[PDB]
RNA sequence: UUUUUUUUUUUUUUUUUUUUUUUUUUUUUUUUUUUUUUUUUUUUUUUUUUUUUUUUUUUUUUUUUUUUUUUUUUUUUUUUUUUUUUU
């Protein structure tokens, strides 16, 4: 089956490629300029705007009698990079919404109303944009609405998304994204700035239910087994302030605790195009199905492949303010961060894989990715993840558990006078948990969080990776060369 | 001490809590501003005083206790009339 999954993935990407090629020709993009990651972003952006069904309802509500509003409902704009003589600039490409719909309906089928097929791939793109926004600008103008601070922001990977995508992206969003959503849903229940809703998810659960259930379900799919998932089960029976308080403490606990939260890679569509043209310029050996997965070393193959000759803008100006500034390899880091979701990964790990030193925001420099008045083109530094690694989704051992099967209330076939490993107390706990015990949960789990943090603050002594874990060479997807990132100071 | 059935799968993967590979919604806004903790641009109360005084630290104009002595002595420093040790 996984080979056929790589094939369906390869077709999915080939569709995105065919759309993008058509989009590039549609706005008049020069052949070399098609490679541009900024152009990837611009097309992907335009597709979000067109596909924003909610905002289209609202647009209609204010579209009024004005013939200028009505004509601009037919036009679609795309700010794109165009180059000449090694210099580069923006152009305002324009095509009608039916032109964009034609390409989309042609490649994905007339039933774009299969919200699953278009929304899956567009969720992944919107997530990549959300990633890049998150590394860029700490979401300030959105958090002035979404009302929460920097630590909450760190756990809120993917929370730059338009609301419609948040259901689609369930697995990969950082726990804070869900938490912030719930906290803001309680504000919406005061403010009326919202419409409440009901949904269903085939292949997962045919349950037919609201944001309340949906969020709690996603929260259960994320939280740590035992106490935190038990708080997740309690959650419908917390009062609203108890929900906010619980959310806060769980969010804080999630700053340490790393239960199942899903990584993903999303390279830009122009990098997928770059992979196609690379395969072409390699004369019939690099095969996209070999790269066609949301997981595993195939992702590092694809990124380092893009690291041969892919192209992007350099503005002389900065996403910065002081006189200290730094090079395109920092853009290359930013791209990597956005592509693999590295924003809360270990910089030391990354420093060894990228095989160059890593950084914090006080040090990070980049451009805006938005097509320029004037600037210059640049191409990729070779092989950049000169070491790779195996991906993953949870803590090494989470927390200390019970005996695995022994030390329970002993059985006795043989008629012999005996001691016993008497354990009726934890047996009665297992009965209490499976019967759904409900008295003293909030505080109980608050305390359990307090002491679990302490236990973890011991467990750190070995709580570090899946036990084969090292930064192997690109000559060593074979995991032959186990080596550590750093000793310390 | 006793007596029969058969339509969800096999000739491998670690020290491990849950479907590990699969399947759809939509009425609070976008095509810029810095090295930054909170709505940065908006919306009502009322019973201790007025139409002057200096270069200035506190109520500047107000409100109660009682067991060691009286109806004299000099130009003046301390109990001026009193109370136990011995190689």
From TrEMBL:
GO CC terms: helical viral capsid; host cell; ribonucleoprotein complex; viral nucleocapsid
Classification via InterPro entries: Flu_NP
Superkingdom: Viruses
Keyword annotations of the record: Capsid protein, Helical capsid protein, Host nucleus, Host-virus interaction, Ribonucleoprotein, RNA-binding, Viral nucleoprotein, Viral penetration into host nucleus, Virion, Virus entry into host cell
Pfam families: Flu_NP (PF00506)
Membrane-crossing residue ranges in chain numbering: none
An MF annotation (GO) of this entry: structural molecule activity
GO-annotated biological processes: symbiont entry into host cell; viral penetration into host nucleus
Name of the protein this chain belongs to: Nucleoprotein
Species, as recorded: Influenza D virus
Gene: NP
């Amino acid at each position: 089956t996984p080979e056929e999954q790589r094939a369906k993935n390869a077709k999915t990407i080939l569709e995105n490629i065919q759309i993008y090629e058509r989009m590039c020709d549609l706005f008049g993009v020069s052949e070399d300029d098609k490679l541009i990651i900024e152009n990837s972003i611009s097309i992907e952006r335009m597709i979000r705007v067109v596909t924003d069904k909610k905002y289209q309802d609202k647009k209609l509500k204010n579209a009024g009698s004005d013939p200028e509003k009505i004509a601009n409902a037919g036009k679609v704009f795309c700010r794109l990079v165009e180059s000449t003589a090694g210099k580069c600039s923006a152009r305002l490409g324009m095509a009608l919404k039916p032109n964009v719909e034609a390409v989309l309906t042609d490649v994905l089928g007339n039933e774009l109303d299969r919200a699953a097929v278009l929304g899956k791939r567009m969720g992944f793109s919107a997530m990549f944009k959300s990633n890049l926004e998150e590394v860029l600008y700490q979401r300030g103008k959105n958090q002035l609405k979404k009302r929460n601070a920097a630590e909450t922001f760190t756990l809120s990977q993917g929370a730059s998304l338009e609301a419609r995508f948040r259901p689609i992206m369930e697995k990969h969003l950082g726990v804070g994204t869900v938490v912030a959503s719930i906290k803001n849903i309680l504000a919406s229940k005061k403010n009326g700035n919202y419409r409440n809703k009901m949904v269903r998810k085939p292949g997962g659960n045919r349950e037919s239910w609201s944001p309340l259930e949906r969020e709690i379900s996603f929260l259960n799919k994320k939280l740590f087994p035992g106490p935190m998932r038990q708080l997740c089960k309690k959650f419908e029976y917390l009062n609203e302030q108890e929900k906010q308080l619980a959310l806060n403490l769980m969010l804080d606990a999630s700053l340490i605790l790393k239960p199942q939260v899903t990584h993903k890679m999303i390279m830009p569509w122009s990098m997928w195009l770059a992979v196609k043209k690379y395969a072409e310029m390699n004369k019939g050996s690099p095969s996209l199905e070999d790269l066609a997965a949301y997981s595993g070393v195939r992702a590092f193959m694809a990124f380092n492949t893009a690291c041969y000759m892919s192209k992007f803008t350099i503005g002389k100006g900065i996403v910065g303010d002081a006189e200290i500034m730094e090079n395109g390899n920092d853009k290359m880091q930013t791209l990597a961060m956005a592509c693999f979701g590295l924003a809360y990964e270990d910089t030391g790990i990354v420093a060894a894989m990228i095989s160059q030193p890593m950084k914090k925001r006080y040090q990070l420099r980049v451009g805006n990715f938005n097509p320029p008045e004037k600037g210059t083109i640049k191409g990729t530094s070779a092989g950049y993840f000169h070491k790779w690694a195996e991906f993953g989704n949870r803590l090494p051992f989470n927390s200390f558990g019970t005996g695995e099967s022994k030390q329970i209330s002993n059985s006795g076939v043989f008629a012999v006078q005996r001691p016993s490993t008497t354990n009726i107390q934890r047996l009665a706990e297992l009965m209490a948990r499976n019967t759904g015990e409900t008295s003293d949960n909030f505080t109980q789990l608050v305390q359990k969080i307090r002491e679990q943090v302490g236990a973890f603050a011991d467990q750190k002594a070995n709580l570090r990776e899946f036990t084969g874990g090292y930064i192997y060479d690109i000559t060593d997807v074979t995991k032959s060369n186990p080596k550590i990132p750093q000793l310390g100071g």
